[PDB]
Structures are given as structure tokens and as C-alpha cells.
Amino acid sequence: GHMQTLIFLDLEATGLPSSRPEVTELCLLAVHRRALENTSISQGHPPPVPRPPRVVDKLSLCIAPGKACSPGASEITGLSKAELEVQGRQRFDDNLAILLRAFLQRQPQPCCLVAHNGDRYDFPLLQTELARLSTPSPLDGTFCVDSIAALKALEQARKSYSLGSIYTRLYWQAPTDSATAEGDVLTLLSICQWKPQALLQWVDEHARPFSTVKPMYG
Amino acid sequence: GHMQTLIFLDLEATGLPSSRPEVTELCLLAVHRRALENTSISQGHPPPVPRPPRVVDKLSLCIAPGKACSPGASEITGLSKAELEVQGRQRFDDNLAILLRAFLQRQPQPCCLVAHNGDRYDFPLLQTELARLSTPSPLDGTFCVDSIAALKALEQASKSYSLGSIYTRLYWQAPTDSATAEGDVLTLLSICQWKPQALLQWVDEHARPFSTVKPMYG
DNA sequence: CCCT
DNA sequence: CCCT
């Protein structure tokens, strides 16, 4: 009934939902409630990009997909199944689920996941990948929330609500290292640090369990 | 008999070995053999700072120590037991050992740890922290190597061997984000990317099992 | 002599 | 219309 740790999440995959994609890279960035509360309210025209908090748990992993990547997805991310296999990256396996659960348990509960276009992409895909695994879902007790829905509410308080479009609106800069699991998570964090205590309170009242998120396929 | 994944490691602690320290933060950065082999040989006067490889697994975690930090250690790292406790960071517990083991198992074996002044600080301390845990050591099958010994051999080939002193010698820049588990690991990676295929071959011939590393105390 |  |  109150979120103690916001886990900023983003995945890079082989393609769009219509292509039945598989995760090629993921990145989680755990940050405590009071880490965000202790952050500068973005003032000035333009305001500076807020510094990430000091105490922050992070996990960036590369994953070998079972199928090839599309030319458009390969170019922007700069990844391919051939390259991931040659560097010995393992599949989305049961070992990965253990690694997530161990990482999650360190974070003070209740934790809420945060992903841009998460309710329509990052969560259903992650749920579908966890559906393949014989082990139970490690994100069972955790909550989730789409940052697009959050920023729409905050900013109305008349168009593109993309990750890159929001970041450039707020701070008037190009995102650093686009098309990388970590780079997009860091960009998402910066957006959420715009009005953090306002964002936190919205997440509390609109956060839902990850188990309620229906999968992409299967 | 041949290292497939170099895991760049560094810890931030409550103090020097003489003070019997405890880990306040750690960061692992796994990179495949071929990732380093596919890297620019640093040419030009001065040479540019090499780009980190694309496919790279990373894990940065904050840990609550059982004892207070020294004023000198607190200032440089910008951390304290009071702040770590208030943000709900757990102790160096059995859960952490599982998280390391799960992370390690993803990396193609045999993997070798790399830490600056590791044989005298980062490895013995990590061994002492793992000695407290009731579970077995997750770094059992892994190897290790001190980057100081590596760079001494490479640089004498064709005085101060600190992490900051080496980085400034090679590229003529100040390290980005000093006194942070991740920032020091990224600095170490850059140093090792100076002559990577030469560094790799030295690590092979001087890499030893982590279990041979005697602990700092206990 | 180097890590914190 | 947004994620890759």
C-alpha cells in the first residue's frame, strides 16, 4: 500500500509485438523512494538534467534470442543474434529468473517496475518470456506502471509522448546513448526526476501487480 | 586453460585493510574475450579513450556495512552507514552470494576476475566477506588477477601505478566519476583496453583461482 | 607502496 | 500511435 523502491526497467528485443519478439538485452535500475524525494525540482529555462541518485542498484544483461533480429531492430540497437551467440550470451533461461529474483529481493518491498510503453510492450513481453520458463515468475510480488500514463497526468497538470520526445521537451537535449537497455533506462530515470515527489504519489495510486499484466503471446 | 570472460571487479568499503573494513558497494562488469580482441589499438598522441564494448553484462549493488565508515573513506566515496541503512540496503548476506553465482554462471567459463590492487585489497576482502556467509563461495570455479601486475608487465614492454595515475598517463584525462564502484570499474576497463590482445595473453599465463587468494582477516 |  |  506504498511503494518503497521504484525499479526502472527497459528491454531491447528482436522486433515489434507483431513479429513475436524475444529479448536481446534488459536493464533494471532500482532506486529507493526517498532517493527520488531527495532530488532537485527542475527549475530554470531550460532546467539542467538531474543527477542520478548516489545509492542505486543496477543490473544490465545481454541475452541470446532464439530467432534472428529484423534489419530495423538490428540497426538502432546495434545488436544481432550472430554477435550475441559468438560472445557466449546464454538464452532467456531459468538461471536468469533466479538472477532477477535475487536482485529483486534486495530491494525493499513493495517494489514497482517502471517501463516506457510498458503496459503495451515491456511488461507483456517480459511476461511471455517468463511464461516459457519452467520456474515460477520472480516478479510475482512486484508491482508495475507505465511511465507514459504517469507523464501524461503530470504534464497535463498536444501530442508525441515518446521517450525521446519527452526528454527533449523537458531539458532540450538529445538522449545520451539511445538504443541500449541501460541508456534508455537512464533516460527514463531523468524524465521521472522532473517532478519526483509528484511522480511518486501518482505511482502509488496507479501501481498494479505485475501478475495482472497479460502476456504478449503464448 | 584459456579465459573466455574477463569480469572487471571493484569494491568500495568502510576503510583500509588495517581498519578491518566491510563492503559498502560492489560492481562487476563481465566482458567476453572476443569483445576485447575486437577493440581499437590506442594510437595517436594522445590516444582517445576506447569505447566500452557493446555486448557487456554489468551489476552494480549497494550494501549496508555492519560498522561505521571512516571520515576519509566516507568523503571520497560519498557514502555512509546511516544513508545506506535509511534507503533499506541489506547486509552482505547469503542472498548476495546467490546473486553473484547466478550472474557468474551466465558468463562463459572459465571467467577471470580483474581488480586494481586486487591481490592486496579487493580479493582478500571479498574472500573475508564470503567467509562470513554460511553458503559456499560462488567464486569457486572462477579465476582472478591483479591489473597492477598486468600493466607493470605491459608498460615495461614495448613509479606510481595507481588506477588514476595510469589512466592519466595513457589518455591524459581525469577519470570520470571517481570513488564509485562502477566508475572505477569503467576506468579499469579503459586501462585494459589500451593493449587488449596483449593484456588478454598475459592474463591467461598469470591467472589463478580465486580460492587460492587468502582472506584479509578471520 | 596501493585500495578506502 | 509507441516499443524494437
UniProtKB/Swiss-Prot annotation, chain B:
Role description: Major cellular 3'-to-5' DNA exonuclease which digests single-stranded DNA (ssDNA) and double-stranded DNA (dsDNA) with mismatched 3' termini. Prevents cell-intrinsic initiation of autoimmunity. Acts by metabolizing DNA fragments from endogenous retroelements, including L1, LTR and SINE elements. Plays a key role in degradation of DNA fragments at cytosolic micronuclei arising from genome instability: its association with the endoplasmic reticulum membrane directs TREX1 to ruptured micronuclei, leading to micronuclear DNA degradation.
UniProt modified residues of type Phosphoserine: S70
Protein name (Swiss-Prot/TrEMBL): Three-prime repair exonuclease 1
Effect of E182K: Impaired ability to associate with CGAS-DNA droplets
Top EC class for this record: hydrolase
Annotated active site: A179 (proton donor/acceptor)
Cofactor(s) for this UniProt protein: Mg(2+)
Gene name as annotated: Trex1
